[PDB]
Write an enzyme that holds these catalytic residues in place. Structure first.
Site, PDB file in Angstrom:
ATOM      1  N   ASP A 181      -6.361  -3.451  10.020  1.00  0.00           N
ATOM      2  CA  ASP A 181      -5.168  -4.094  10.927  1.00  0.00           C
ATOM      3  C   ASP A 181      -4.940  -5.491  10.044  1.00  0.00           C
ATOM      4  OD1 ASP A 181      -5.297  -2.596  13.404  1.00  0.00           O
ATOM      5  OD2 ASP A 181      -6.008  -4.241  14.554  1.00  0.00           O
ATOM      6  N   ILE A 219       8.833  -1.274   4.845  1.00  0.00           N
ATOM      7  CA  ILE A 219       9.093  -2.113   3.569  1.00  0.00           C
ATOM      8  C   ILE A 219       7.663  -2.449   2.935  1.00  0.00           C
ATOM      9  CG2 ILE A 219      11.284  -2.986   4.380  1.00  0.00           C
ATOM     10  CD1 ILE A 219       9.811  -5.892   4.980  1.00  0.00           C
ATOM     11  N   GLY A 220       6.564  -2.638   3.732  1.00  0.00           N
ATOM     12  CA  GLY A 220       5.211  -3.084   3.315  1.00  0.00           C
ATOM     13  C   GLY A 220       4.508  -2.077   2.565  1.00  0.00           C
ATOM     14  N   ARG A 221       3.610  -1.398   3.561  1.00  0.00           N
ATOM     15  CA  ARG A 221       2.739  -0.286   3.234  1.00  0.00           C
ATOM     16  C   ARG A 221       3.670   0.790   2.638  1.00  0.00           C
ATOM     17  NH1 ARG A 221      -0.801   0.061   8.966  1.00  0.00           N
ATOM     18  NH2 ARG A 221      -1.227  -2.194   8.678  1.00  0.00           N
ATOM     19  N   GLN A 262       5.423  -6.871   1.064  1.00  0.00           N
ATOM     20  CA  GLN A 262       5.470  -7.922   2.072  1.00  0.00           C
ATOM     21  C   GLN A 262       4.751  -9.211   1.653  1.00  0.00           C
ATOM     22  OE1 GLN A 262       5.014  -5.466   5.582  1.00  0.00           O
ATOM     23  NE2 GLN A 262       6.584  -6.831   6.328  1.00  0.00           N
TER      24      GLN A 262
END
Ligand SMILES: COCCNC1CCN(C(C)=O)CC1
Ligand SMILES: COCCNC1CCN(C(C)=O)CC1
Length: 284
Positions: A181, A219-221, A262
């Site tokens: 998380d 966009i991140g993972r 990110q």
């Protein structure tokens, strides 16, 4: 510089935040006018994450062709990816329309439906064989065929039917279920094992349309997945693998979608994944 020793040099000097801010400063800025039209407000999960006009995926519809999704086309590596947000309640039909129209074989999901006590995307696939889903706005039917639950990820076989033509296709759903998380994984081993399982399925290969990859914002993972895959492929293709520059590859990918990677922790994790992966591909 090479990668593994550039890596230890940034760790010892504690300068990951400065490296990451340089990337943010040099990244491309292209218009995203279609994403910001008022009629598309409920098609975007986050007001600050939008597809560029030049690389956005268009739905084959004359009313409204907009979806929050981008085509990342890597010319030297000869790989393409579609990066998209997690579907919203009012875009699950658009999502599967895109999968159909772009001839994708696989969908890669890197989030859980609920994280941190909040909904991160809609429940957009069926959970029981005998309870199929119908998307009336785009005239598609989706059935769960089989499910294989493993310790770090789940693979599902799905049938997508175009109800207008009665054509059917098999779609593979690759669901990485153990990203924490908060933060990033301590070891890249399970993420790399997952990447290799996607590769082995054919879902990334040129005989199919581009894989669709998503997390919550896309966009991140999601950026970590395609960045690691492309860097490892380039290390296999080139005469000098130490010439592969992960910062340069990331800036190339950011020509096609904003914001990829990110946090500085995601940047460090991407380095770690490519470094460990390059040893398994061969023998150290
Ligand atoms: C009886 O209702 C069947 C609904 N099929 C799907 C279920 C998933 N959907 C959402 C918005 O979560 C879109 C429609
Ligand atoms: C200075 O030497 C750096 C060597 N980089 C390695 C070269 C071999 N590689 C592969 C994948 O074959 C990975 C990158």
């Amino acid at each position: 510089m090479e990668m593994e020793k550039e890596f230890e040099q940034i760790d010892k000097s504690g300068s990951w935040a400065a490296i990451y801010q340089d990337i943010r400063h040099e990244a491309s800025d292209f218009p995203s006018r279609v994403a910001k039209l008022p009629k598309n407000k409920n098609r975007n999960r986050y007001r600050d994450v939008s597809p560029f006009d030049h690389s956005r995926i268009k739905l084959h519809q004359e009313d409204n062709d907009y979806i929050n999704a981008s085509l990342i086309k890597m010319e030297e590596a000869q790989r393409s990816y579609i990066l998209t947000q997690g579907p919203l309640p009012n875009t699950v039909g658009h999502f599967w329309e895109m999968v159909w129209e772009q001839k994708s074989r696989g969908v890669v999901m890197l989030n859980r439906v609920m994280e941190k006590g909040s909904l991160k995307c809609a429940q957009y696939w069926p959970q029981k064989e005998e309870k199929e889903m119908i998307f009336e706005d785009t005239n598609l039917k989706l059935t769960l065929i089989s499910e294989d639950i493993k310790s770090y990820y789940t693979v599902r076989q799905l049938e997508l039917e175009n109800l207008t033509t009665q054509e059917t296709r098999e779609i593979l759903h690759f669901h990485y279920t153990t990203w924490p998380d908060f933060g990033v994984p301590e070891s890249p081993a399970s993420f790399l094992n997952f990447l290799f399982k996607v590769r082995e399925s054919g879902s990334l290969s040129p005989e199919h349309g581009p894989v669709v990859v998503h997390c919550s914002a896309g966009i991140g993972r999601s950026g970590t997945f395609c960045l690691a895959d492309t860097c490892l492929l380039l290390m296999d293709k080139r005469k000098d693998p130490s010439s592969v520059d992960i910062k340069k590859v990331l800036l190339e990918m950011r020509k096609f979608r904003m914001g990829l990677i990110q946090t500085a922790d995601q940047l460090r994790f991407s380095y770690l994944a490519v470094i460990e992966g390059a040893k398994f591909i061969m023998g150290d």
